[PDB]
Amino acid sequence: PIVQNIQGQMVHQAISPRTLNAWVKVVEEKAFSPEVIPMFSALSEGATPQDLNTMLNTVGGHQAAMQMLKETINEEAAEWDRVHPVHAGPIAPGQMREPRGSDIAGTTSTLQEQIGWMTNNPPIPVGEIYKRWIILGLNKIVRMYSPTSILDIRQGPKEPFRDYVDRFYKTLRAEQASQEVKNWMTETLLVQNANPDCKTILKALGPAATLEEMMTACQG
Amino acid sequence: PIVQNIQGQMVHQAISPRTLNAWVKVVEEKAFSPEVIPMFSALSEGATPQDLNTMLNTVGGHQAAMQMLKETINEEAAEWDRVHPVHAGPIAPGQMREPRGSDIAGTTSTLQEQIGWMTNNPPIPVGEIYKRWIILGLNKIVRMYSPTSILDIRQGPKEPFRDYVDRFYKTLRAEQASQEVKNWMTETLLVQNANPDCKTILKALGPAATLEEMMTACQG
Amino acid sequence: PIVQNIQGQMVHQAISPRTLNAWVKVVEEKAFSPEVIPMFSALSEGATPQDLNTMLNTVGGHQAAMQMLKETINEEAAEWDRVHPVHAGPIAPGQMREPRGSDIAGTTSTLQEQIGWMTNNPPIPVGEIYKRWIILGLNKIVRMYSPTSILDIRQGPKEPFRDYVDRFYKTLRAEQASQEVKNWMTETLLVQNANPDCKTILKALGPAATLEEMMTACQG
Amino acid sequence: PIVQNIQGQMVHQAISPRTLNAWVKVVEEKAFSPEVIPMFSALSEGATPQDLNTMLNTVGGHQAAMQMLKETINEEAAEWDRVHPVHAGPIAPGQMREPRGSDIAGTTSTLQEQIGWMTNNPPIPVGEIYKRWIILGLNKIVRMYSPTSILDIRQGPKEPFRDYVDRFYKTLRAEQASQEVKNWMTETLLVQNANPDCKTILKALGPAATLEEMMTACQG
Amino acid sequence: PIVQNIQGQMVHQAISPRTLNAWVKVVEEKAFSPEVIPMFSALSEGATPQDLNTMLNTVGGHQAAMQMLKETINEEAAEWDRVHPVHAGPIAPGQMREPRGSDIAGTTSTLQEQIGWMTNNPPIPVGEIYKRWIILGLNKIVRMYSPTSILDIRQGPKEPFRDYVDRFYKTLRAEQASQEVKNWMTETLLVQNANPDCKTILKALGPAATLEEMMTACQG
Amino acid sequence: PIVQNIQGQMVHQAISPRTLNAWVKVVEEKAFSPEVIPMFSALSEGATPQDLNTMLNTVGGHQAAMQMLKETINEEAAEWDRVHPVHAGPIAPGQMREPRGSDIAGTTSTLQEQIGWMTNNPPIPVGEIYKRWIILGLNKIVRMYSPTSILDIRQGPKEPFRDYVDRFYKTLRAEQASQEVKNWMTETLLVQNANPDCKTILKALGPAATLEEMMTACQG
């Protein structure tokens, strides 16, 4: 990943083994849960497409998820090539040729060319584009790992309200259908599926009730 | 987070992966203890709102508590907007605009805008305001996670005074109240709920005795 | 490796103890899984043949695999020396001589000659060729460690489609067939070797079958 | 702490997470040994009272010891405020006001006043006084924590002289008496409490008894 | 060890404690094995003789091996003195004196003299010579620590070919002999000492069969 | 400990918690052994007397050894004060007053005075003097912790020669009576205490025998 110097300029730097070790360990230990996308975006800030291909190929196991991510990256690269055709002929001396989708992916280009793209004037953010594509692929992967659907949630007679709302919001963050649909769901489905006693305790507070009073009602 | 860089010019330095790993580990190992608030305040010194959002997203589990935190952040932003109205219009070329609640919460404010608001002279304390909001939310969460009320703390028949006062002060620190209420409670509730064998000893010492005198009295 | 100094001449640097410890640890911990080749290509970047020989010699155990890797390096060096004539006699100053196969292998050269061949104009990628040879050898090794073949994978009656495709893609990554033959295999045998229920499911799905829709269809 | 830049101003720097992690680790693993005070004085060097309050609040458990430490800090602040009058009214610019005891404790001020007091000419060190108070409190704590007294140490019939002198010097380090009383006891009760055989050996050794001579005499 | 410092001026940097801890750990777990010589050469790149003495003194236990190493260093020093005589007389102000046989081992040579001998132009390769001596000593020690001879390696009746060839090549690498002798030793000993069934299986392949074909013959 | 900068000058630096942790761990885990002195000399290179007093006070347990070290430091300081009396009266402006015997230890001087003494023109090596004193004290400590004398060594009928020579050289390095006496002991006492069979096998080689042949004789 590129790093700025004392005078402000930046140059390529070898990827730290600690970053790769932490990424592989968090992938192994935390599997594919909603909290891998923020850590992935934090680990590889400013990473070249070669570094992202490293961080993806290094993930042993869960090869189906990695194949899904590869297919998503392939579709995004095809759409990018369709929306931005590259020109042919001689290239200007002060400009380097613009990358194609397969080259934005970093599959058929050298590291020096990535560094030249990233430190050009004006700079070309190939790393950020490929990171956005990988984040979309990881969103689709965490959507696939979702164990249950949002509608099938029903609290057991003994399962505490805390565990119920924990499971609910876990699969809700794993759903990621939309934002306003999520807002409507947390109003309706959250109170629609409570245990009868605590259910009517929550209905006593009306729809204006917030989550804090919703929990301290059934609390104790 | 931004940091003083040689010489005297603050530049943006992205959050280090080791800090995020330390935060994830302390939230995994210690759950939601009263001490986490200081650990959080010390792990994110001078952090941009984006860094605090990253540190709140990287949490694993406890989604209910994170939801209360987000809702209290929204409430604080609404109160800030009600107290500090923002006038519309073109901005000055050298001075930045006054941020709104959504600009403080890092939701609709780009990283460059926050860096501007922080490094500009005079500085806008967006980081400290968002930290105060998150600290209020964490206080709410740790006061909710209290298993039993402070009024229910009672010593066992053979439970030593050591563990009794330890658990009592732990629950009292987790409990929420003004300092004078705590000053009254440590004098009215501590000696009364003790075991009678050592309760007689504490009564023999006196009402206004300090903690160390009672502790060395019932020692052994 | 050879770290490139900021806005200056590229300076040689000894391999880091951290890098070597991470390498020996991943070897010892994961034996020879298909990801050791990407992780090796990641750790060893811009490294001299001396660095690569050190990284290979620090490996303890698996001496059969090490001897096979050395035999592969010897075969590659023999082929290189056969298809590339070696010049001799007086050599003009400021121009290094023709690198022999035993020299590009690093067994008959020195760090000075390696750095000279890596700093010449135009540069000669001695490191990138020796790394290619090591990757060919490691590919042979990981093919030898393959427990079962790819054509002999059959899904269990209770073993789910996720686990089945995980094993299938692991064996495919281990497989030695060319990429053109590799595609037909994952297009045909994946649906041809599954259990009858989801086999008929994917048959009703028909052509253009992709992994995402396959896994969403075989749910439950 | 306050790191002194090389040929520059003493720039303020937030406490690194490593310092707090080591502090919580030692206070968790080693409880309250006599040496923790030296390690606490080592980790916190040139630190603002805010840093010391952060280091104290991060301590988890042993809340009775923390309350005793806060009571000791309050007593020291009351004494300081009693024996030092506090000026008021308009204050000349460029000269900070009189530091109050509750202010020298850092409970009624911000970081700016502490940094100003630690940068004035002549310097007024708030850190070296608040650390002194914390050390007095930790000394009271470690004295309270000692399980056995110094006057009640007796060597076992089979327990050798080395273990006896180890326990004796540990309890002496935990002792609260003045240094001259400490010298008196370490001169007399050491040989006055040993086992009769080596007691007579050390009596034959006579005056000017020195520890290495004692341990070389009681050998075997 | 000295290191290239920005810009282009080598200055002395003391050995880091982490390197010493890594060396103590590798001489605690790996103990003495063939892999230690490569690890030692990588941990001490460009080390002054004082650093190598420090790394050889920190080894706890195995005093016989360290004495062998010291005696072989003395023998190499005597041979260097007998081959490179040192003339006595006043030294030139610009250039340094020729190091004697004991100036290499860092016994009577101060650190400044070694730094001079290394940074001078032309440099005196004292570090590499002392490293060659220590490597000869370590080769002696690892050839001594061999439990059995290479002629005694024989496969068990049901011991798989994998463990047999692994142990055989490990003992052969630990053994000391010229590579030319090993070329006959392998083709004479590997197939002969195998199990009778696998013996005939390998003999069916041919005498000059490679290691990979011989392996895949009896695979499973 | 002081550290050099880019311009070449040195200034005080806070002691790293990693150094203290490593020292405490090596002191406790390895207790007292001849290989604690090199580790101590390597850990605290360039450390101020305050840092050495820290590293000594931080050692919990083995308080008798620490008191021996304190007594040795006291005697060395008294001898230094006797051999170098300090002058009275006003001190020159360009010179700082020379440290007394007790101030070399850093017991009655602030850190700034130590830094001024260490970076004066010409520099005064108080740190190196106090390190020499501490190394002498640690030598006396490891002398006391020697379990057995050098003469009592007699190999058992079954105890292998390797264990015998290991124990011999261990207690010989722990003896440190002299260096030439050590050379005479390794000739006489090593050959005088062997088991009769291997004893006469060693006598078959005469006194000219070296250690390598000495052990490979009794080997196998």
Side-chain angles (χ1 to χ4, degrees):
Chain A
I2 55 174
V3 56
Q4 60 196 14
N5 81 321
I6 307 313
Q7 312 175 339
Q9 69 165 273
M10 60 200 69
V11 59
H12 178 76
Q13 174 197 358
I15 178 174
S16 60
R18 298 220 312 275
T19 301
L20 266 175
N21 291 157
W23 163 246
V24 177
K25 281 178 186 179
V26 72
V27 160
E28 290 322 323
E29 316 170 23
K30 282 189 176 180
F32 264 116
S33 308
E35 54 270 18
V36 292
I37 301 179
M39 293 185 74
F40 178 80
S41 87
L43 282 170
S44 75
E45 281 165 313
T48 65
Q50 174 165 344
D51 294 17
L52 295 175
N53 292 321
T54 287
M55 293 182 58
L56 296 188
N57 295 325
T58 309
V59 174
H62 309 263
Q63 294 282 5
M66 306 306 306
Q67 188 70 16
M68 263 197 63
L69 171 54
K70 198 172 187 176
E71 293 297 326
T72 300
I73 287 182
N74 189 15
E75 304 298 330
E76 294 293 335
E79 292 199 13
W80 170 274
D81 183 78
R82 178 202 60 83
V83 75
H84 272 76
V86 71
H87 304 333
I91 180 64
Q95 185 60 92
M96 183 204 318
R97 66 179 196 91
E98 292 159 7
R100 61 176 292 102
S102 159
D103 285 328
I104 290 293
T107 65
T108 76
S109 315
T110 175
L111 176 68
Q112 188 271 341
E113 187 145 289
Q114 272 77 244
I115 295 307
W117 278 322
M118 203 164 268
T119 43
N120 198 14
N121 274 107
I124 308 303
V126 56
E128 314 299 327
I129 294 170
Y130 193 68
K131 187 183 307 179
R132 289 160 178 172
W133 295 358
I134 294 177
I135 286 182
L136 195 142
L138 287 163
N139 285 283
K140 289 190 177 179
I141 291 164
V142 70
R143 278 185 174 184
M144 185 200 70
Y145 270 94
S146 316
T148 79
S149 159
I150 186 61
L151 56 90
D152 263 348
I153 300 170
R154 284 171 191 179
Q155 186 168 352
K158 192 45 193 93
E159 188 176 14
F161 184 76
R162 172 62 81 98
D163 302 4
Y164 162 81
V165 65
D166 269 345
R167 179 170 167 181
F168 175 84
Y169 269 104
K170 178 200 171 184
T171 177
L172 184 58
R173 196 190 188 189
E175 171 185 356
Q176 282 299 19
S178 285
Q179 184 58 253
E180 285 73 16
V181 194
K182 181 185 305 301
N183 291 331
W184 172 78
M185 275 185 290
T186 177
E187 309 147 10
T188 77
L189 273 296
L190 198 49
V191 308
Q192 270 207 9
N193 294 114
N195 280 333
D197 55 356
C198 276
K199 189 176 185 177
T200 176
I201 311 166
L202 318 174
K203 314 281 173 283
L205 296 181
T210 42
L211 189 54
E212 172 181 337
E213 58 207 9
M214 192 87 58
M215 280 165 315
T216 179
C218 199
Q219 184 184 4
Chain B
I2 53 179
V3 58
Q4 304 91 337
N5 172 260
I6 304 181
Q7 174 58 234
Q9 184 177 188
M10 297 181 176
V11 305
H12 196 261
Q13 168 205 354
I15 176 172
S16 316
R18 48 172 185 167
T19 300
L20 273 187
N21 269 330
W23 172 246
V24 171
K25 279 193 173 184
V26 68
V27 181
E28 181 195 279
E29 288 180 355
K30 287 191 175 183
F32 267 104
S33 302
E35 56 255 16
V36 312
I37 298 102
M39 190 79 65
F40 166 77
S41 316
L43 275 159
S44 87
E45 290 287 345
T48 78
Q50 181 193 21
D51 312 300
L52 297 159
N53 293 138
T54 311
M55 287 179 49
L56 293 186
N57 294 328
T58 46
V59 70
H62 307 267
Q63 290 286 349
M66 308 313 297
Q67 200 57 41
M68 317 166 55
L69 177 49
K70 174 188 293 184
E71 188 197 44
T72 48
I73 289 167
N74 283 329
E75 164 182 355
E76 291 296 325
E79 274 203 349
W80 166 274
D81 289 14
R82 278 164 181 165
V83 175
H84 293 70
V86 194
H87 319 290
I91 50 184
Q95 289 298 322
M96 264 57 73
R97 49 178 174 85
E98 196 276 331
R100 225 177 297 106
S102 316
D103 293 331
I104 292 185
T107 59
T108 80
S109 44
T110 307
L111 183 56
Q112 189 59 43
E113 320 168 19
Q114 310 159 322
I115 294 170
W117 281 314
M118 279 178 306
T119 71
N120 184 77
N121 44 1
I124 305 294
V126 54
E128 288 105 0
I129 284 170
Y130 196 48
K131 185 174 298 180
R132 291 197 220 104
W133 295 353
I134 298 181
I135 281 174
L136 196 148
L138 285 169
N139 284 282
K140 274 197 180 185
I141 293 166
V142 300
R143 89 182 58 180
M144 170 152 196
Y145 262 101
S146 159
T148 70
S149 312
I150 192 54
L151 273 297
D152 292 78
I153 290 297
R154 284 191 173 185
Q155 191 178 7
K158 191 42 202 173
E159 162 171 87
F161 187 80
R162 296 283 304 278
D163 305 359
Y164 159 67
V165 61
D166 288 326
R167 168 164 143 266
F168 170 78
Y169 278 161
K170 190 157 188 177
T171 300
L172 181 51
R173 187 194 178 180
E175 203 266 339
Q176 68 287 354
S178 73
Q179 207 275 334
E180 183 264 299
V181 171
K182 292 185 175 180
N183 298 333
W184 177 92
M185 267 169 61
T186 186
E187 279 136 29
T188 320
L189 193 83
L190 175 50
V191 195
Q192 179 180 358
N193 292 117
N195 191 83
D197 190 328
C198 272
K199 180 180 178 180
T200 299
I201 308 178
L202 320 175
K203 266 282 198 59
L205 261 71
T210 81
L211 172 62
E212 55 185 359
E213 320 293 353
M214 314 178 180
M215 187 153 179
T216 191
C218 187
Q219 181 179 180
Chain C
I2 312 179
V3 63
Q4 284 201 169
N5 190 359
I6 297 87
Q7 64 205 339
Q9 310 89 3
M10 50 174 181
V11 55
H12 177 272
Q13 178 177 310
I15 47 180
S16 306
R18 305 200 152 212
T19 291
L20 259 189
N21 184 35
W23 164 244
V24 61
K25 188 174 183 177
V26 60
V27 180
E28 192 145 0
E29 293 298 2
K30 270 187 165 296
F32 267 117
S33 278
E35 76 266 356
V36 308
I37 305 180
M39 211 187 301
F40 164 70
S41 315
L43 290 175
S44 85
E45 280 187 327
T48 80
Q50 183 265 329
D51 312 309
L52 301 180
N53 273 320
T54 303
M55 292 178 57
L56 290 186
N57 292 338
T58 59
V59 166
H62 318 266
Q63 288 308 314
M66 291 299 305
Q67 187 59 44
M68 268 182 44
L69 170 57
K70 290 187 289 184
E71 188 271 341
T72 310
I73 293 185
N74 263 357
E75 270 198 1
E76 288 298 323
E79 181 266 358
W80 165 279
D81 263 347
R82 184 163 191 170
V83 308
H84 286 89
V86 193
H87 311 283
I91 299 313
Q95 287 198 227
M96 279 60 65
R97 62 189 187 92
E98 204 276 341
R100 198 161 183 169
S102 315
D103 263 8
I104 196 164
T107 69
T108 55
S109 163
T110 189
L111 179 64
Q112 188 67 21
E113 299 183 12
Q114 310 291 17
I115 295 179
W117 285 335
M118 262 176 298
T119 192
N120 199 19
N121 306 327
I124 308 299
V126 52
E128 303 306 300
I129 298 166
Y130 192 70
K131 180 168 309 165
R132 221 172 184 176
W133 295 0
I134 295 178
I135 294 169
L136 298 172
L138 293 170
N139 272 317
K140 299 226 177 185
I141 295 173
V142 69
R143 291 158 185 185
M144 189 182 51
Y145 256 79
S146 159
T148 79
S149 159
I150 181 64
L151 298 174
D152 308 329
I153 302 192
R154 308 257 163 167
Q155 183 178 3
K158 185 59 71 174
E159 182 204 310
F161 184 70
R162 289 184 170 179
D163 296 331
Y164 160 72
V165 71
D166 272 337
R167 303 176 187 180
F168 179 83
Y169 286 163
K170 177 186 178 183
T171 310
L172 194 61
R173 197 185 192 185
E175 190 46 50
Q176 67 182 359
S178 87
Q179 195 70 14
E180 271 68 1
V181 181
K182 195 168 179 174
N183 306 330
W184 168 91
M185 263 163 58
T186 192
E187 299 195 0
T188 57
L189 320 173
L190 175 58
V191 310
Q192 282 189 357
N193 263 317
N195 278 335
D197 307 330
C198 287
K199 183 164 131 53
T200 66
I201 293 182
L202 302 181
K203 275 283 281 163
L205 192 139
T210 61
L211 193 64
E212 49 270 22
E213 54 190 270
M214 286 193 247
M215 280 178 302
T216 57
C218 191
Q219 289 165 347
Chain D
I2 311 176
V3 54
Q4 285 202 166
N5 188 359
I6 302 94
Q7 169 47 22
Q9 302 85 9
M10 47 155 67
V11 56
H12 176 272
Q13 173 178 314
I15 46 180
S16 158
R18 303 202 157 202
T19 294
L20 291 173
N21 189 29
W23 166 244
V24 301
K25 193 172 186 175
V26 60
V27 72
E28 192 144 359
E29 291 188 13
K30 263 193 163 299
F32 267 119
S33 289
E35 80 266 5
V36 315
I37 302 180
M39 204 190 305
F40 164 72
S41 189
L43 293 173
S44 84
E45 283 185 325
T48 70
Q50 185 267 330
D51 313 318
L52 303 178
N53 276 322
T54 303
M55 291 178 56
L56 289 184
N57 290 335
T58 42
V59 164
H62 320 268
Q63 284 305 315
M66 294 296 307
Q67 187 58 228
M68 288 172 65
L69 171 58
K70 289 185 290 184
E71 188 271 341
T72 313
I73 293 186
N74 264 357
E75 265 197 3
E76 289 296 324
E79 180 266 358
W80 172 279
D81 264 347
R82 185 164 192 170
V83 304
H84 291 98
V86 193
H87 312 281
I91 298 314
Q95 288 199 216
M96 280 62 66
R97 62 190 188 92
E98 204 275 342
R100 195 157 184 170
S102 315
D103 204 316
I104 207 165
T107 68
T108 55
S109 161
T110 188
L111 180 65
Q112 190 74 5
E113 301 181 14
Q114 324 286 355
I115 292 188
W117 285 335
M118 275 177 293
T119 43
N120 197 20
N121 307 327
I124 309 295
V126 60
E128 311 306 290
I129 311 175
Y130 193 71
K131 179 168 309 162
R132 222 172 183 176
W133 296 0
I134 296 176
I135 286 170
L136 297 172
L138 289 167
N139 272 316
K140 298 222 176 186
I141 293 173
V142 69
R143 291 159 186 184
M144 176 166 53
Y145 253 87
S146 59
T148 79
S149 159
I150 188 64
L151 292 183
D152 309 328
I153 303 190
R154 307 255 164 168
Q155 182 178 4
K158 181 59 70 175
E159 182 204 310
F161 185 66
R162 290 183 171 179
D163 296 331
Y164 159 74
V165 67
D166 288 330
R167 300 173 187 179
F168 177 83
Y169 262 97
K170 175 186 175 183
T171 306
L172 193 63
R173 199 187 195 188
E175 195 40 55
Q176 68 182 357
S178 88
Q179 195 66 19
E180 72 89 8
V181 190
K182 283 199 61 152
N183 301 331
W184 178 91
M185 43 186 47
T186 199
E187 180 177 330
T188 55
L189 310 164
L190 176 57
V191 310
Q192 279 193 358
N193 263 317
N195 274 340
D197 310 329
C198 276
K199 183 164 171 313
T200 62
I201 296 180
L202 298 177
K203 274 282 282 162
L205 193 140
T210 296
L211 196 55
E212 56 264 22
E213 306 167 1
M214 306 185 218
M215 277 175 300
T216 50
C218 194
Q219 288 172 359
Chain E
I2 52 179
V3 58
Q4 305 91 337
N5 171 260
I6 303 181
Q7 175 58 233
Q9 182 177 184
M10 298 181 176
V11 305
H12 196 260
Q13 169 204 353
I15 176 172
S16 316
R18 48 171 185 167
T19 300
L20 271 189
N21 270 330
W23 174 245
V24 176
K25 282 195 174 183
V26 75
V27 185
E28 184 185 90
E29 302 167 355
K30 290 293 187 62
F32 274 113
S33 300
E35 41 255 28
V36 311
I37 294 169
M39 189 76 61
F40 166 77
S41 315
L43 281 162
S44 88
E45 286 290 338
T48 78
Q50 182 195 19
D51 312 300
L52 296 164
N53 295 136
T54 313
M55 284 179 47
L56 291 184
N57 293 326
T58 48
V59 166
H62 308 267
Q63 290 292 342
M66 288 305 150
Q67 194 65 26
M68 301 170 68
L69 178 48
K70 174 187 294 183
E71 188 197 44
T72 48
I73 288 167
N74 283 328
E75 165 181 355
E76 293 295 326
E79 198 147 6
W80 167 275
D81 268 322
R82 284 167 180 167
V83 175
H84 292 70
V86 194
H87 318 291
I91 53 183
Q95 293 295 323
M96 265 63 72
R97 50 178 171 85
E98 216 279 328
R100 304 183 298 104
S102 192
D103 310 336
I104 299 193
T107 58
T108 80
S109 44
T110 321
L111 181 58
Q112 189 59 44
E113 321 168 16
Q114 305 156 336
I115 295 170
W117 278 314
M118 278 176 304
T119 62
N120 190 72
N121 50 3
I124 306 295
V126 53
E128 288 105 0
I129 287 171
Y130 195 46
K131 185 174 298 180
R132 291 197 220 104
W133 295 352
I134 298 180
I135 281 175
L136 291 176
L138 285 170
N139 282 283
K140 275 197 178 185
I141 299 165
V142 297
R143 95 183 63 167
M144 181 195 204
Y145 261 95
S146 158
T148 63
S149 316
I150 197 54
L151 265 295
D152 206 276
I153 290 299
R154 281 191 172 185
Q155 186 188 25
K158 191 42 202 172
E159 182 205 29
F161 188 80
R162 299 303 309 275
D163 295 29
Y164 157 70
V165 61
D166 287 325
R167 178 164 137 266
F168 172 79
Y169 278 163
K170 188 156 188 176
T171 299
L172 183 53
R173 186 196 177 180
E175 199 259 3
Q176 176 260 356
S178 67
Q179 197 272 335
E180 294 80 11
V181 170
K182 294 183 177 179
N183 302 328
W184 171 93
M185 202 185 266
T186 173
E187 290 138 10
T188 304
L189 275 298
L190 168 59
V191 194
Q192 181 177 355
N193 300 129
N195 261 335
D197 55 288
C198 272
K199 184 175 179 172
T200 62
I201 288 173
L202 309 163
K203 292 197 69 173
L205 264 66
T210 81
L211 174 62
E212 53 186 359
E213 321 290 7
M214 289 184 175
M215 179 42 234
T216 193
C218 273
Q219 180 178 178
Chain F
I2 59 169
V3 56
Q4 58 191 14
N5 81 319
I6 307 313
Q7 322 163 20
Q9 69 171 2
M10 306 163 295
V11 60
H12 180 77
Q13 174 196 359
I15 179 174
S16 60
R18 299 220 314 275
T19 300
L20 269 177
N21 290 157
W23 163 248
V24 174
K25 284 178 182 179
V26 72
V27 160
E28 303 307 10
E29 314 176 26
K30 286 189 176 180
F32 280 99
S33 297
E35 62 269 11
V36 73
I37 299 179
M39 278 290 298
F40 178 81
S41 87
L43 281 170
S44 78
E45 282 166 313
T48 61
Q50 174 165 343
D51 294 17
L52 295 174
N53 292 321
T54 287
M55 293 182 58
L56 296 188
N57 295 325
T58 313
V59 174
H62 309 261
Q63 291 283 4
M66 306 306 306
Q67 188 68 17
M68 291 178 71
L69 170 54
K70 197 172 187 176
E71 292 296 326
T72 301
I73 287 181
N74 187 358
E75 304 298 329
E76 295 293 336
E79 292 199 13
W80 171 275
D81 193 58
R82 177 203 61 84
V83 74
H84 273 75
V86 71
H87 306 330
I91 179 65
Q95 185 47 268
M96 321 315 188
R97 66 179 198 92
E98 292 158 8
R100 74 171 290 93
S102 159
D103 286 320
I104 294 293
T107 64
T108 55
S109 315
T110 178
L111 178 67
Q112 190 272 338
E113 292 181 354
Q114 272 76 244
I115 293 305
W117 280 327
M118 186 162 287
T119 50
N120 199 14
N121 274 287
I124 309 303
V126 57
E128 313 299 326
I129 293 170
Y130 195 61
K131 188 183 307 179
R132 290 160 179 172
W133 295 358
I134 293 176
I135 287 182
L136 195 142
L138 287 163
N139 285 283
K140 289 190 177 180
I141 290 163
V142 76
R143 276 185 174 184
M144 186 202 71
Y145 277 100
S146 316
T148 79
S149 159
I150 186 60
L151 56 91
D152 262 348
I153 299 170
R154 285 174 190 179
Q155 180 175 350
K158 186 53 211 93
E159 188 177 16
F161 183 76
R162 177 66 83 92
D163 301 4
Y164 153 78
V165 67
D166 270 346
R167 180 169 165 181
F168 175 85
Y169 271 107
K170 180 200 170 184
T171 177
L172 187 60
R173 196 191 187 190
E175 173 184 355
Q176 283 299 8
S178 279
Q179 208 271 338
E180 283 72 17
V181 194
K182 189 183 293 293
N183 293 330
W184 172 78
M185 274 184 289
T186 177
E187 309 148 9
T188 77
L189 273 297
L190 200 50
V191 310
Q192 273 209 8
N193 294 114
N195 281 331
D197 55 356
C198 275
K199 189 176 185 177
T200 177
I201 311 166
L202 318 173
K203 306 201 181 323
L205 298 180
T210 43
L211 191 57
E212 173 181 336
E213 59 207 10
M214 205 68 157
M215 306 170 286
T216 180
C218 200
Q219 183 187 187

